[PDB]
Design a binder for this molecule. Structure first.
Ligand SMILES: Cc1cc2nc3c(=O)[nH]c(=O)nc-3n(C[C@H](O)[C@H](O)[C@H](O)COP(=O)(O)OP(=O)(O)OC[C@H]3O[C@@H](n4cnc5c(N)ncnc54)[C@H](O)[C@@H]3O)c2cc1C
Ligand SMILES: Cc1cc2nc3c(=O)[nH]c(=O)nc-3n(C[C@H](O)[C@H](O)[C@H](O)COP(=O)(O)OP(=O)(O)OC[C@H]3O[C@@H](n4cnc5c(N)ncnc54)[C@H](O)[C@@H]3O)c2cc1C
Ligand SMILES: [K+]
Ligand SMILES: [K+]
Lengths: 969, 941
């Protein structure tokens, strides 16, 4: 509305005029803080180094660490140490009211004398243990106890009447904020109910004490990952205390979901006949959400045009004010436009002042704050307190917030103010900027398949449903598939659920040597026509197989949950990876499929091109039973070979999915043959066969090396020297440097070691921790481990579950016993009673390179902890096995990271994240040494391993004449 | 511009006085269509394109195809008749009787004549004799006729002469038609062979006081032909009727002309010159560019039109000593000669004009009415095959030149790769270089060649003499042999050198290869001469070995620079993935004797430049050439231990080297038997062994060339002879089976065997010899037994003489009747034993081509697009060559290697090769800290 907007602009103009020349303290260049922010706003490279240096600072406990990091980041001594320490502490102190409860209450009271209310927060988020969650909870209880004893002596902040005991006459004097992720270390929508209950139970304990002193509790909103969980905690706590009005929730206007979330919540309040309070903010995690989404192949949950967040805020604030009778409103913004909008919308709607207040962050926007105090009178400061390390996330969000290009505050106080532009109706700005914003073979470029996203109710509902549906399909007999036809044999092997082995999923026919011979012959007969099929047409078959899998994504995942004990996310990622291989290798064949002219001499034409080899034997593992199976089979297929495929005997139903997918794609008969069989009956037979030209194997070293020896022999009638593609496992280390962010390292190490019960060739089985941070890291690692539960993978509350089968359990348990003798147990989890191949989550310390569990691949949930004296020994220890598949390092030292990139010679080295989870294209996967033969699946050199090059050279000069070609010399 | 205006006007006077390509292709191939089936198939194929053809042709082609051979007879009758009639407009006859008759209708029209024989390329001594005797036969017929010939109208002189001064009988002769192996590589032998035949023809010419003119052919033979003319002139100084052709398009011509005139004056003789522009322009430019030779011709057409006038003038000036024939169809060129002569008052007995008999009759006559003395160049021979073989315009070309002249990339800072220039025996310095360097090598014999380990020479008590296979009494040197102890020391040195070398920047590693390449280039003739003596390489074979070694160095240097930069993969924000390559460790390089520098350097330098360290075992019979690698890397300053030289007895140290746990890669080129054994032993992982051993293996072939029934035999025969017998057949790429279609078989085998008969077997230091001794006594005994096996299996067609006395000589041997079931159709002989297989149809030819366990190279000669496309698809070898020999793969142009029992699919000299010596690594970094990440340019954002 033009009339309302005019009032808003005019108020905004009066506001700017009143603060003309004033700047927030943070930008004051008479202080280190101000100069650093100035430099950061001027130079992106410096900003990154500066903010990263702030993050690593608390770990720099020695003079050596401090001076070296300064040189590495930016390139008597005691006093210089304290100069630097004081500077960083100044940056942290900028945004906090204290370090202890006592100091906070004291400064809280000085703030009241200046006329400011407060919402008090205990710094902390993303907790790592139950014990840490308890400390955080008890800190709030301690705060409330101290506040209960002081508030009686507080005169209520000046207001226009009401109760002089209350702030402004109506607001409770005690107001606290709590971050839900500080309340549960395993908060995750994958375990939606368990997360809600764990957080709710601690929140209730805090809320009960709040209600004791008639105070206000506001629940902060954190990353999008937990948004739905947090709304549910609020709804549940609210209904438990339906008559208590002082409970609030943060809603984030920068979220696309927020128009609906706010509508849902207002309707919900009406339906349940309760009142609510909403602190409307834009949102604090924008940089994170954008990146996190793209990295994890989820949809971006925030608006990406800044004005869209402003417009949404004005929309949503208006909706709230219109509903002031049921919804109390806290306007939390430092933006003069946004603030003036709220003031004029409230005026127009005639909203009583007891229904809305203004909030700003402590240590920011002081001139804006001063204006609100003068004009509105009701201004509350978000006041956090605590130490630098638990407050580091918050601190960095403030540094980013105040220096961002799109920041209102930066544009008002760090740049020359363009007031007319700053005060524009953001809806108008959205229209303009939205307007302005507006591969080969015809194929769109490759993108990894969307990962399951348990923020979605439908994705959360899908798994229990598909798992149940799978259970309606048990008991079937799975035949061989040879030359386009189903072939039954008499020999059946049941396949069972490792988490509940009495549950039989199906019976699998076994191929004898005769049937495998029939499969090889069919592959061989099909080969000439398939070899002669256009590469683009072969690619099209893979694309059709991918679409078929895409249609069955949840169903395919559910099968893996039951047949091999994949957790929901592990199962889904297995299927999406199979899909990625199909899409990526289709495109790779299209690229490689066109002959290239080579040389540039006239009178001559040379073309270099590729052809397939013949029949490929594909021998797949059980641990990534669809992904790796499909990767090897489809690479061989798309390059023009025909395949005889032996799935693992314990994931043969998953192996059958390859049959179903290629059948739906309509692949020609003979090109793909499915011959599950007993290795003792047909393993050597398949590898030895004279008509095999390629073997693609992923498995243990022992088996891989045996195949490599047997395959080397050229038998009578054998056409080619057999090509080997082999991936043979690892004994992978993660190094924890002394400057590592332990809050990051702990959950990544835990996932690397115990994800899918440790049954990955990439799994971390050695964590090599520098002596200087050893006790601190191990305490935190063990504490998080203790909170995790072992049990059936179909139950998403469980972190890990049964290993693959009875033989694997016996082998892993024997290794666990060896390890317990070699070192000392640091943690050994309980397991469920009754049936299931359960091995405890096991962590063993005191391990050294000479120990068997530091050398031999266990392939189970047994983590060796190695205490290294310095970074040089960590590297040496990392390199001390015969394997070299993956590795990880947590370090914030450029020099150490460079040393690791050069010297930690593994196939896939990961810096500051888990060392599992390689994605197609992004992380081509595979290594050398005893871990493989240097082939990397999902990368641009892989398909060539399944082919051989040919050249055709033509003499184009006939009778002393040759046609000129465009690229001739 | 006095003469110019006068030239323009002499010219003005004169001026008043897809389907087409398919048609040309059809006439070309027509003489080969010897069956109705062949004829209908080629009509169907050549004129089948519905879109690009007239609908008459398009519809006829389809009809021809549907009728098949049943429709052939009527087509042959019609097409032959029409083509014979067409040919009659360019060729004066195919019998002497028919010739004379038209030569007389020509005299009775105002035209003199020069007669030339148009036939197939001379590929044998018999064919040279047929050509020669055809001239003798025309001269006898002309002798018996020129008496009754009324001399052409004139102004003075003998009226029993043409124009009163010109002999009535004039013949032109093509030099290379007199000697099928004419080659400047054997300059003197080529001169003598041709001269001996030219002399016999000339005497018959002098017997009837006629004129003999010696044609000029391609640049390859120019200096040979000039020397022939001289030797012949001095033999008959006083006989004035001998002529030579000079080509104005050659940059050499100015000096060649001046030198010839001088030479004449000095020896006090007269000469005659037929000045032409040049008939081989496209050939010369392509051949020069394929070999990095100097381009011998101008490349602006006007430059040739200008050079002609320059040179015609100079000739006319010296008319007292040099008679002159103007041979051009260019009005400006004829005009400008005319006036230049008449502006220097050259008597008319000193210049005549020559044009093609095939020139349009009105143009031919209207030109006579201005120039007066026109001689017709009159081709003579078989009509059908003969036809298969067949204003501003008046401006001063020098002006045109000044104007058109006036009107007129690599990475890593390095120029783009280009193959090292091949030796050029048209150069006197290149011809002189081999005898010199061979003699210099002979001053260096008798040395003891030590091991080279960790930068040091290491001697052992066990010495093996290396000898000349063409003269085994000649001992070139003694080679120290490494026992297992020394090989272990080499392996340990390599392993100790590896970490520092792996960490050496790829651009720096490449720099060492570039320095080794410059070092080899500096010693090219010397390095070549050594191979001539140590392994019996012929001059060109030796030089090509060294140039290929240089090419591997230059190419692999560039490949490592390309591959050495990590590449970001993926495009997710908050994340950096970099994909890059690392070396494996110690490489065993086990090299063959047959390309002793090229293959050795290729495998060694590839391993070295990729960051591996090398333990190198040369063949026991080419260890001095192996020592050259030591010299070259030493001169490049390669760090100690990176390259180690350990010749040793395979029986003593071969398995030890392959089996060693510290070896990570084995690069082998050699026999299948040895390669497969290496593959089996390398597969095993021994205690302490770090990697699964990587195999790079090339294991030989049983390579076929298919001769389709429409093949051009003038090209196919010599290419097959070279492919089979070049370097005594000792190549993994050699043609050991020639599979010949039934309809062309008898003609092909006659010409091939007759060519083989013309060649000589003997010492490879003698450039006159085609091939020489095989590698050693063991090879000789083995090859000879295979020959005896073959002779029992099939039918010997040719077995050459060999020199008496010492030397490992195997006869050049051709055996027919060979079928796929035969041992010599299956087993690699590696010597000069060629199996000839008669295939009943093209389908069978393909099936026979694919009938061995090998698949290295192949070749096909065909002019059928459908047969060629079938070969490209189904003749599945690593390197298939169409319409040329199947040997001589060049770096980059022909990356080399195959699969089946021929190799493991590695191709030396190509863009996938270096990757086989490395393993890939990925580093993945999470760049997000505390909720923010640096924005990268290549991010999806
Ligand atoms: C008292 C208080 C409590 C808060 N509590 C929370 C909380 O519990 N949870 C939470 O997530 N946030 C919370 N916030 C908000 C957050 O911390 C920032 O303070 C706030 O987003 C800044 O907005 P603005 O109107 O002050 O400044 P502005 O400069 O107007 O707005 C900046 C905001 O715009 C958004 N933005 C930036 N770039 C883009 C873009 N390209 N596209 C779309 N949007 C963009 C971001 O949200 C950014 O913070 C709170 C804020 C206050 C004052
Ligand atoms: C009677 C007679 C005898 C002959 N004898 C021989 C012989 O023994 N040896 C021999 O080699 N040929 C011989 N020729 C052919 C001669 O050399 C030329 O091929 C042809 O005659 C030139 O034709 P032109 O002067 O009529 O016409 P033009 O159009 O004037 O001349 C064409 C010529 O220009 C030259 N040319 C074309 N393009 C370029 C370019 N881009 N740069 C530089 N030069 C260029 C070529 O030589 C080409 O032949 C003979 C020709 C005749 C008529
Ligand atoms: K199972
Ligand atoms: K020798």
């Amino acid at each position: 509305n033009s009339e309302l907007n005019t009032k808003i602009v005019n108020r905004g103009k009066e506001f700017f005029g009143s603060i003309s020349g004033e700047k927030p303290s943070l930008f004051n260049k008479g202080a280190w803080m101000g100069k650093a922010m100035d430099w950061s706003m001027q130079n992106e490279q410096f900003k990154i180094q500066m903010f990263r240096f702030v993050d690593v600072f608390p770990s720099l406990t020695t003079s050596k660490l401090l001076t070296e990091h300064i040189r590495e980041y930016f390139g008597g001594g005691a006093v210089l140490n304290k100069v630097l320490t004081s500077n960083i502490e100044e940056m942290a102190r900028q945004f906090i009211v204290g370090e202890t409860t006592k100091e906070a209450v004291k400064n809280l009271e000085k703030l009241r004398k200046d006329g400011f209310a407060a919402v008090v927060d205990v710094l902390g988020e993303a907790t790592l243990s139950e014990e840490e969650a308890e400390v955080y909870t008890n800190t709030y209880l301690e705060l409330l106890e101290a506040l209960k004893k002081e508030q009686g002596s507080w005169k209520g902040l000046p207001g226009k009447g009401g109760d002089p005991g209350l702030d402004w006459g109506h607001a409770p004097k005690v107001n606290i904020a709590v971050k839900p992720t500080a309340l549960f270390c395993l908060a995750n929508p994958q375990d939606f109910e368990g997360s809600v209950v764990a957080i709710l139970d601690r929140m209730r304990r805090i809320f009960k004490k709040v209600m004791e002193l008639n105070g206000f509790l506001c629940i902060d909103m954190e990353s999008y990952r937990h948004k739905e969980i947090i709304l549910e905690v609020f709804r549940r706590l609210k209904l438990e205390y339906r008559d208590y009005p002082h409970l609030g929730i943060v809603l984030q206007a920068y979220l696309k979901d927020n128009d609906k979330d706010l509508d849902d919540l207002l309707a919900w309040a009406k339906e349940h006949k309760v009142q609510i309070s909403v602190r409307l903010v834009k949102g604090a995690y924008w940089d994170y959400e954008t990146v996190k989404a793209k990295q994890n192949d989820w949809e971006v949950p925030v608006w990406t045009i800044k004005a869209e967040s402003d417009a949404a805020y004005e929309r949503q604030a208006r909706k709230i004010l219109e509903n002031h009778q049921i919804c109390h409103f806290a306007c939390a913004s430092h933006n003069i436009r946004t603030i003036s909008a709220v003031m004029e919308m409230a005026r127009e709607l005639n909203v009583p002042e007891d229904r809305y207040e203004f909030q700003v962050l402590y240590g920011m926007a002081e001139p804006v704050r001063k204006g609100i105090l003068k004009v509105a009178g009701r201004i509350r400061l978000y006041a956090p307190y605590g130490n630098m390390v638990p407050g580091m996330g918050y601190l960095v969000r403030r540094l980013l917030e105040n220096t961002a290009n799109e920041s209102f505050l930066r544009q008002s106080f760090a740049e020359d103010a363009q007031i007319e532009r700053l005060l524009e109706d953001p809806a108008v700005t959205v229209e303009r900027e939205r307007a302005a914003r507006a591969g080969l073979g015809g194929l769109p470029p490759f993108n990894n398949e969307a990962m399951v996203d348990f923020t979605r109710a439908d994705h959360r509902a899908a798994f229990p449903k598909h798992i149940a549906q799978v259970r309606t399909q048990l008991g079937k007999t799975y035949p061989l598939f040879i030359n386009g036809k189903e072939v039954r044999t008499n020999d059946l092997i049941p396949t069972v659920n490792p988490n509940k082995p009495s549950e039989v999923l199906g019976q699998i026919c076994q191929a004898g040597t005769t049937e495998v011979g029939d499969a090889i012959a069919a592959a061989k007969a099909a080969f000439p026509a398939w070899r002669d099929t256009d590469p683009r047409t072969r690619a099209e078959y893979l694309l059709k197989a991918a679409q078929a899998a895409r249609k069955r994504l949840f169903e395919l995942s559910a099968w893996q949950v039951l047949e091999i004990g994949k957790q929901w996310d592990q199962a889904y990622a297995d299927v999406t990876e199979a899909i990625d291989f199909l899409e990526y290798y289709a495109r790779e064949m299209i690229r490689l499929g066109q002959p290239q002219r080579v040389g540039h001499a006239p009178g001559e034409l040379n073309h270099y091109f590729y052809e397939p080899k013949g029949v490929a034997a594909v021998i797949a593992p059980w641990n990534f039973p669809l992904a790796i199976s499909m990767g090897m089979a489809s690479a061989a297929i798309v390059t023009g070979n025909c395949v005889v495929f032996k799935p693992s005997g314990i994931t043969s139903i998953i192996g059958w999915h390859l049959v179903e997918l290629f059948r739906e794609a309509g692949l020609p008969e003979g090109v793909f043959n499915f011959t599950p069989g007993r290795g003792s009956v047909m393993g050597d037979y398949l590898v030895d066969h004279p008509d095999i030209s390629l073997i693609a194997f992923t498995g243990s070293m022992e088996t891989g090396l045996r195949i490599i020896e047997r395959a080397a022999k050229v038998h009578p009638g054998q056409a080619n020297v057999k090509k080997i593609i082999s991936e043979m496992g690892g004994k992978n280390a993660i190094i924890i440097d002394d400057d590592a962010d332990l809050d990051e390292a702990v959950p990544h190490v835990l996932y690397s070691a115990f994800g899918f019960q440790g049954q990955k060739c990439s799994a971390c089985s050695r964590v090599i921790v520098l002596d200087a941070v050893y006790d601190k890291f191990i305490e935190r690692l063990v504490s998080m481990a203790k909170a995790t539960k072992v049990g059936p993978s179909e139950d998403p509350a469980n972190y890990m579950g049964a290993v693959a089968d009875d033989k694997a359990m016996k082998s892993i348990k024997e290794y666990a016993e060896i390890g317990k003798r070699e070192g000392h147990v640091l943690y050994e989890s309980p397991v469920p009673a009754g049936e299931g191949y359960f091995v405890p989550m096991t962590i063993i310390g005191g391990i050294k390179p000479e120990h068997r569990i530091a050398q031999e691949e266990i392939f189970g949930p047994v983590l060796a902890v190695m205490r290294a004296k310095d970074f040089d020994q960590a590297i040496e220890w990392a390199n001390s096995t015969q394997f070299a598949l993956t590795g990880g390092i947590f370090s914030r030292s450029p020099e150490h990271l460079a040393k690791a990139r050069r010297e930690f010679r593994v196939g896939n080295l990961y810096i500051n994240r888990n060392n599992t989870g390689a994605l197609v294209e992004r992380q081509p996967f595979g290594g050398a040494r005893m871990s493989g033969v240097g082939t990397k699946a999902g990368g641009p050199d892989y398909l060539l391993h399944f082919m051989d090059p040919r050249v055709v050279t033509e003499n184009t000069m006939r009778r002393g004449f040759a046609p000129i070609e465009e690229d001739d010399d």
